[PDB]
Design a protein around this nucleic acid. Structure first.
Ligand SMILES: [Zn+2]
Ligand SMILES: [Zn+2]
Ligand SMILES: [Zn+2]
Ligand SMILES: [Zn+2]
Ligand SMILES: [Zn+2]
Ligand SMILES: [Zn+2]
Lengths: 123, 121
RNA sequence: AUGCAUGUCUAAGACAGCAU
């Protein structure tokens, strides 16, 4: 579909934050869609990119790439999260939706809160 | 904390499935925590792995790596997730990326991209 | 040798690439 504004609600450690991501176009060369946070200093905008690659000479499976980049103003630091999905030509949408919704749920588990928010491995 | 059973509910396209992932030990060599579904064959079970890397002399950043592997009775579906944070990152910043990602994965854009393999234009 | 917020696959592994 057409690249539109994404509004992400009840996020943050608290679940009290909203993030409005405005469309910044689809690059015709590589198909990468770009969004970035409304309302901020260009170089400090929280950013998202998404791409979907078909099988080709270069590639046996479908590959979906999701990337987040969040700047903090200074020493300027960046936080990154990068997601790659891999799905064959014979996967079903039930299978792909399972992985998508699995990961979303995983990201709210005590196991992943400790690893990410607290940087604590399980033992 | 001690590697423990993870129960993920209200998942699948329908929002009506639940996955129960059981502890399969932390690797003494590399710190990698394994979990997996119950089942009769180790190769037809849905898997998750988690790892946290500390900064060393060699690398200046923290890194959290999650892998999902879901086989079907035979093709494999994968998700690979890397988080990369500086030593001066705060927990507010890391939790923001975490929960931002989870929400992103429920948006029309990612439903289109992942479920329907349909990019935006 | 190390590193990667690069990619590819039979995926905690292999391989291609970049950087140092
Ligand atoms: Zn279907
Ligand atoms: Zn992968
Ligand atoms: Zn990497
Ligand atoms: Zn890679
Ligand atoms: Zn690997
Ligand atoms: Zn190489």
């Amino acid at each position: 579909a057409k690249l539109e504004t994404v509004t992400l609600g009840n996020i943050g450690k608290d679940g009290k934050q909203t993030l409005v991501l405005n469309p910044r176009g689809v690059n015709p060369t590589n198909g990468v869609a770009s969004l970035s946070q409304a309302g901020a200093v260009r170089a400090l905008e929280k950013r998202v990119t998404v791409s979907v690659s078909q099988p080709s000479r270069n590639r046996k499976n479908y590959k979906v790439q999701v990337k987040i980049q969040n700047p903090t103003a200074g020493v300027t630091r960046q936080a990154y999260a990068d997601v790659t999905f891999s799905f064959t030509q014979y996967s079903t949408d039930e299978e792909r939706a399972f992985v998508r919704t699995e990961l979303a749920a995983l990201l709210a588990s005590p196991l992943l809160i400790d690893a990410i928010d607290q940087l604590r491995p399980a033992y």
